[PDB]
Amino acid sequence: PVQRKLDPNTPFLTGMRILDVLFPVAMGGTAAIPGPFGAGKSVTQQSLAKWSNADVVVYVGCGERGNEMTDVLVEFPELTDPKTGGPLMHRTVLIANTSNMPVAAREASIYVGVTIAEYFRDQGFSVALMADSTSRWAEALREISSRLEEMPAEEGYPPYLAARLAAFYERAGKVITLGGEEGAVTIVGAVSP
Amino acid sequence: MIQGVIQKIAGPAVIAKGMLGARMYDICKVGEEGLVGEIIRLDGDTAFVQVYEDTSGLKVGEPVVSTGLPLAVELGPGMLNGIYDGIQRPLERIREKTGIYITRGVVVHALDREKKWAWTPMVKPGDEVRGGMVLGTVPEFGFTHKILVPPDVRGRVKEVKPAGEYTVEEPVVVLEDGTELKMYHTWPVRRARPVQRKLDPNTPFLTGMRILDVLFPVAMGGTAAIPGPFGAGKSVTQQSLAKWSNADVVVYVGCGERGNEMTDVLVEFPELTDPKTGGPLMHRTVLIANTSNMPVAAREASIYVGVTIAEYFRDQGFSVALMADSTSRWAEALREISSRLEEMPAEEGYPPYLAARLAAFYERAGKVITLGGEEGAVTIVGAVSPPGGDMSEPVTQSTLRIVGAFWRLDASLAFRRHFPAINWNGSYSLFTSALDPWYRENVAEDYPELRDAISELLQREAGLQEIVQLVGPDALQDAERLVIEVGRIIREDFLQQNAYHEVDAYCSMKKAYGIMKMILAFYKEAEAAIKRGVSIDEILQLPVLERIGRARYVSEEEFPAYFEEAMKEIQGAFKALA
Amino acid sequence: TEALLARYRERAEAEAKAVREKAMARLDEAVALVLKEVLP
Amino acid sequence: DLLKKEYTGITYISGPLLFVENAKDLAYGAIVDIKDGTGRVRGGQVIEVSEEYAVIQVFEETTGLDLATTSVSLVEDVARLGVSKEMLGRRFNGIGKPIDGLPPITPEKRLPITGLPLNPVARRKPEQFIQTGISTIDVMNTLVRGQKLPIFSGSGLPANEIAAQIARQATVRPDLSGEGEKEEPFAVVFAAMGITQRELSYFIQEFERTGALSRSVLFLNKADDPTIERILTPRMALTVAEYLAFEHDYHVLVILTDMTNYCEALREIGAAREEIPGRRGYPGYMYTDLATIYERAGVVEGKKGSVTQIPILSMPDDDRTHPIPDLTGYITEGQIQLSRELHRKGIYPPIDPLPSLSRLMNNGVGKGKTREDHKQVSDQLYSAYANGVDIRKLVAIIGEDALTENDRRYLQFADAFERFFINQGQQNRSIEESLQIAWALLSMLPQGELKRISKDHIGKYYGQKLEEIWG
Amino acid sequence: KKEYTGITYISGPLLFVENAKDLAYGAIVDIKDGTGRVRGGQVIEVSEEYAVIQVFEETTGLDLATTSVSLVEDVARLGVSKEMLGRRFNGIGKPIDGLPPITPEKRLPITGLPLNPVARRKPEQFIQTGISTIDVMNTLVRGQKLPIFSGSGLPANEIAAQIARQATVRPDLSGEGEKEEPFAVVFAAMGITQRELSYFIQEFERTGALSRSVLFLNKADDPTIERILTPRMALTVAEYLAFEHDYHVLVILTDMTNYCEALREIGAAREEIPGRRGYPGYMYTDLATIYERAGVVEGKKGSVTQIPILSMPDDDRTHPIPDLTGYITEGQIQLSRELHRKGIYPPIDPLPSLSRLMNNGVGKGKTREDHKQVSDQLYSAYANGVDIRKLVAIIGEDALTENDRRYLQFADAFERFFINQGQQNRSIEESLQIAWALLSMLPQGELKRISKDHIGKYYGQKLEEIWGAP
Amino acid sequence: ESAGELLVATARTQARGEVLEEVRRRVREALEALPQKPEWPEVVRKLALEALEALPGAKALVANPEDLPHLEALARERGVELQAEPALRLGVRAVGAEGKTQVENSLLARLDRAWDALSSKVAQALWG
Amino acid sequence: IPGIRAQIRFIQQVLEQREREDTFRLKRIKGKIEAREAEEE
Ligand SMILES: Nc1ncnc2c1ncn2[C@@H]1O[C@H](COP(=O)(O)OP(=O)(O)OP(=O)(O)O)[C@@H](O)[C@H]1O
Ligand SMILES: Nc1ncnc2c1ncn2[C@@H]1O[C@H](COP(=O)(O)OP(=O)(O)O)[C@@H](O)[C@H]1O
Ligand SMILES: [Mg+2]
């Protein structure tokens, strides 16, 4: 719960000129990014982590390959936080899931991440949440629906896919916490068709 | 025996109660008429029986008796030059006992019990014998039918009959243990007959068709599948293989197809001649017939009966060819019985075990060392009938994963009456590399190179057709036009073959080699000519093109002289211009 | 060359004899061990 | 045999089905009579019998039935029809009862309507060439006596006219083949399933005009009649046809108006029984059920009669891959396929020869049967027409002016073929006239293009022009 | 020991047995009939009233009066050892080469525990397969999952055998390295025919490659449950060797299409509603549990590498099997029907192929410092060559510029020499030499993606360096 | 070059297999002499106790005619019926109460069940 | 190009519709089997 949700009046400054100028995102807004190979998506995401004005960063990897998860788990313990010069890892939380991990974990990973982000927001900070490959999460949702013998819609997806996506994405926003302070959660979701 | 009563009747399915102690896949007699059935499910005190005959008129409460044995065939002398139904009943004797129609409950023997055979023993008393050994010889239509020990019998010979004439029921050889060995024995159709060792295939199966024998060869022990929509030409191709192949024995299985085709075979084959022996063609053929309006459940049994007979003849030391007229009918019969069982379907309603059944059926082919120390082979060519010509159908997709050669038929070629109508782009063969030494020794030393050149020309023509569909033939350069025209010449004068012509119906390997040689020589000369500025539009009207086109119809023995004349003309027609 | 094959066959049969000689000593020890272990 | 037993105890009525419980004396496939409170009697057949209950399909509507007063009685253990030689010239409804007001016929025999399979050893080669008077059939898709040659049609296409014309003009040619010159006319057995008043009136008027009603047996099941009766009509018609052919040496021509309605009724029963569907909801045993009908034609050794079948069916969306046309083509011995494109252009009959086929053609043509150039001429026509259609495709892209002379020749050949060979109207062409027209058309192409024809025939027949026939 | 005789139902592949609540779910059992023949089966469902057993093979002779069922093992396990190298097994670990059974050092459940994500390390060393189009352009790195996409008539078995015969590690290029690092090959074949089985046996035995290999061979007429089990047993052996004896193992799974079909049949036999296009809904998870068993572990010297091989059902990359395999693996190698019909072996098409971990396994200290630039230049030049080859059919060669003619000749020579290597075994240095000889056909300065230092060091060598013995 | 290595490996492995099969034959022929030993009644008592403790609520005990005299006391003590069965040898059988389940405690079954477990120890003792 | 793309989307819709119908039928028959087993045994 929160007291009240505020309007998107202030910016989420990512530090990249194209993003901060031509396609800005407000603090408490939502953004999406496709994941073509060789386009340097991971570099942009770690730049968002390093340079944006978010106090805390939450990274969610829901269904990534084993070696990609290895790469992301090895790279972050090496990055340095520009604001202090100490390790960037001292202000991040990592949720990691590979493809061969149980389906329930892969389905609940994004909810766990957004709940932790909401907690840190309720403490009065500004949190950046980055969900990598929500397509894999959708695949897990489809598998769970298949195990329950439900009539599919469109390309085999359960008919309530959009409702779940909205329920995940609508938790972002700048609010007046129950303590009277201000906090925000910004969500960047990678989608890989 | 186990005896029960009918509890429920619905079409070809009967549920019998009081049948505790029966075993799966056992033969049962249903009703007072004694219709043959087979147990496919046991549930407590009941049994589920699929009846191999029509069940109209049966009533609840009639007796059901289990014989305690699975479906089996009698293997021995007397099967050649014969026709059988799905469960091995001679159709001639049914036609004698019954009128022109087929009725229920007719009991006849698969092997004639009255005929006398000239027995010539080969074992002597006091010899140890083993399953698969030869006991004697019986002449049959120019063959030497060899009496075999059943595959799982051991002992030592006590006494043997003297040479003479006996029926198949005579106990010619008696072992020490007192078991009597007759001229025949029975074998369960669902069990593959054992062999000593499988062997690699290194000898071609000569089908008589240029395209199949050259571009997509099949080895002696291999398997091939020929799918296509209705009207494509499966049956004509299979009958051509039956007429012209070099196999010693042919077993033809008409599973669920038209009866007029079986009649055509029965009427024509006595008048034709065996390619190698010179005697009547029908003397080397066995027909198993189960037409469309015959009972559904016998479709599955017909395939097993055919393959078991083929395996037996292989065990005798022959090379056998087995043609299945349609396996999609077997799949449909399985689907119907599964619907009766009220099972969970898979894909287009087929039972989940369809692919396993197909793999088990197709894996019985191969060249083997028989248990008797001989060498034999079975070659399986199976036709497929996809619904609507849709090659994504589960039966076709299952067949792709196990066959060695794939002969795909095209509806567009059949519409324009271009036969055999093989889709070259969609076909393949996996025996091409293994047969190269045989071709080098028996056809020509450079035959593989010519075949590969022809394949490359066809590939280039297929590549250019994509552009031709866009800008038309006239927009191309001259070399591309030459490639297109040579491709058309190959399509019309080499790949095409008339199954009803008196000479074109059969084509030897050397004739095909000669035709390929002539075409390649002409293409080389034309390319050299257009290199030096000769117009392509003038090349197309050269006088030798018609001779190349009509070289198909030359007789087999006139061909070498025609080939010499045509090669000299090929040299002259471009040397004279210079 | 087939001399290498002959040498390999010689060393293989020598190894077979050596391992058989190794077994022969403790054959009875192994038999007693299994006979003890199988019984309750 | 002569006593009447009634089974009360009906526990279920819904759609075309009806369950009766204490009846285990009903044989599988028996025929029953269902009587309600008002005394009306309806027919039915047992499609499943058990110790618990029996399942009965009702041949009429179920209006007015109830579970308190209805009773079921046995008629016969096996469905049979009373056939007689004196039923030529009569009319019956879908279940064999007279509708022409005349007294019921006295049966010589009672034959089961499902029939029996013919022994392939007892069969015979179909060989007699039948001259239909239609060029696209006589020359390219020859019909022989004893064949099953269906017609594939559409919603507005005139398949009924073609069937009536074939029945009117069909004749054998004893003089060509040298057979015993006999002029016995065909006997026509006509079965209609779900036919409308317009089509039925057309057929009746045509038969009256040709005076063939005295040699015809009619089984009429109209479109407002009960649907489930259609499961029986083809069986009764073919039972009568087989009896006449193989016991009185008639040459019978059987016409089945629309197998699509038959498949609709079959699907209704299949869906009511929760059967496992094939493609598009049709039952899995439809192949077997159709084969039990189509396979009843042919000729038998040692007998003079014959049965020939001309089923008519409408491809639902003009889609040749629909299950009904697909299975029919997999069973029968060819097909005559109609073209909507030819119909729109004013061509009659609009038979497209490329998708058509005749499997038994090679038996009934050639030297000593029609003429020694028949088969080669047919093949040459096929190849030339295919090339013409291909060039038609090409000019739609590259324009007509860019064609060569050879392509223009083939294009003109295709146009002339469509406008003179296919389009004949309502006229009866002999086989010689059709062959003459075919040679006239083939003379357009250069003599060296005729690769499929031997040089003797080309020398003998090529050259004569089309204007000498018209113009 | 303990037997159950309360059979109440036999139908299809299933049978029901009463009073069997001591059988654990997923156990393996023996089924014996009146004649004394014993069959195999697996428990797929347990209840207080009865247990359901899916029988291996066939239920031909079974009855409800003489059949009995007894337990074999609660969990399907395999006994592993280092003596397995040089042995052939039937897909459930039963030897098929006539040699005595192995003596296990331990028995492990064939279904594998997941690797802890924090325990993995980054793949950084390559494997030399001896095939130029793979080593140079689609490099295979230790710990990678790189499948092969093939068609109906394409010779994927020959490629698999050649890779198994020629693959090796190259320590001498990695600084000084260690001269001794064990290498082994684990070969798994699912649903193969007799012809392919004989071919594989001959190929593995005629060259001595069997002495470092373990073969799990499952025939097409074998039971489907054995087919489901085979890859898991192969991966169990691979993991054991790699992570307890510091081996470098390479796993080859011969056909995943057969595995998918077997999985579909098994699912349908248990009355499960299928997902997209008739395949099980959980197919992605199953394929992931198979594929994700490869990788390199921090603190360990061993590795596991996988080359799955699968035939595209209708050359359709949209099909669920290739589509789901693409999500989990790092790139693909795709064969070409055109190259095969043109007479080129191995028919690997460089343009659609891709290796997603190539950048980490090449460079300085591994392979050679010019590797990445050379591969990029080869890719671009071949694309240009095929485009111009298409255009010349319309406009003719005389209408082309000099560069276009040179590109066309380069593409032809590339296809004839770089790809069509036959049964030749090429080291990385030989492949790079051939690549530079081909690049020298192009004029210097058109080599945009190669630095000037490498061009000065290597450019200008003539094709007769390899043409002397191509 | 590799054919010789394969020959050596095959010879060594087949020699080891021969040694283990000889050990198995020896233990098989050793086990079958126990009924002659005076310790046999204690062995059959232990086997019957193991079988009945392995089959809770067991109905009856089934044994060989020549071995049931050593098991008369236990059946009455345990409150179950004992039967005679010549086919069962050097072991005991207990039939469950329902009649569907049963257990076996023959020594040969135990030997073939534990041979795979003891093979490693056999190899270690012989050549380790 | 737009025409062929429209045809492709149309055919995809037809195939997906047929697949959905088949799933519905399988669901119904499984429900009937389960009901029969759990109610009448
Ligand atoms: N913002 C950037 N600044 C500098 N170099 C960049 C930047 N983005 C990308 N690059 C370069 O381009 C390469 C992109 O390819 P690479 O595969 O390495 O990317 P990635 O970030 O791992 O992402 P992806 O997994 O989508 O390929 C980077 O390795 C780097 O060399
Ligand atoms: N190779 C051929 N040569 C000549 N005619 C053929 C050939 N193949 C098919 N035909 C004609 O096409 C018709 C097609 O039927 P059929 O050959 O049995 O194919 P399918 O079994 O697919 O129907 C046959 O009657 C046949 O006369
Ligand atoms: Mg056919």
Author numbering:
A (entry chain B): 194 to 386
B (entry chain A): 1 to 578
C (entry chain K): 81 to 120
D (entry chain F): 2 to 472
E (entry chain D): 5 to 474
F (entry chain L): 61 to 188
G (entry chain G): 169 to 209
From the paper:
V/A-ATPase is a motor protein that shares a common rotary catalytic mechanism with FoF1 ATP synthase. The V1 domain of Tth V/A-ATPase (A3B3D1F1) is an ATP-driven rotary motor where the central DF shaft rotates inside the hexameric A3B3 containing three catalytic sites, each composed of an AB dimer. When powered by ATP hydrolysis, the V1 domain rotates the central rotor against the A3B3 hexamer, composed of three catalytic AB dimers adopting different conformations (ABopen, ABsemi, and ABclosed). Here, we report the atomic models of 18 catalytic intermediates of the V1 domain of V/A-ATPase under different reaction conditions, determined by single particle cryo-EM.
Cryo-grids were prepared using a reaction mixture of nucleotide-free V/A-ATPase, containing the regenerating system and ATP at a saturating concentration of 6 mM. The reaction mixture was incubated for 120 s at 25 °C and then loaded onto a holey grid, followed by flash freezing. We determined three rotational states followed by focused refinement using a V1EG mask for each state. In these structures, nucleotide densities have been identified in the three catalytic sites. Hereafter, we refer to the structures obtained at ATP saturating conditions as V3nuc. The V3nuc structure, obtained under ATP saturation conditions shows all three catalytic sites occupied by ATP or the products of hydrolysis (ADP + Pi). In the V3nuc structure, where nucleotides are bound to all three AB dimers, three distinct but associated catalytic events occur at the three AB dimers simultaneously and these events are coupled to the first 120° rotation step of the DF shaft.
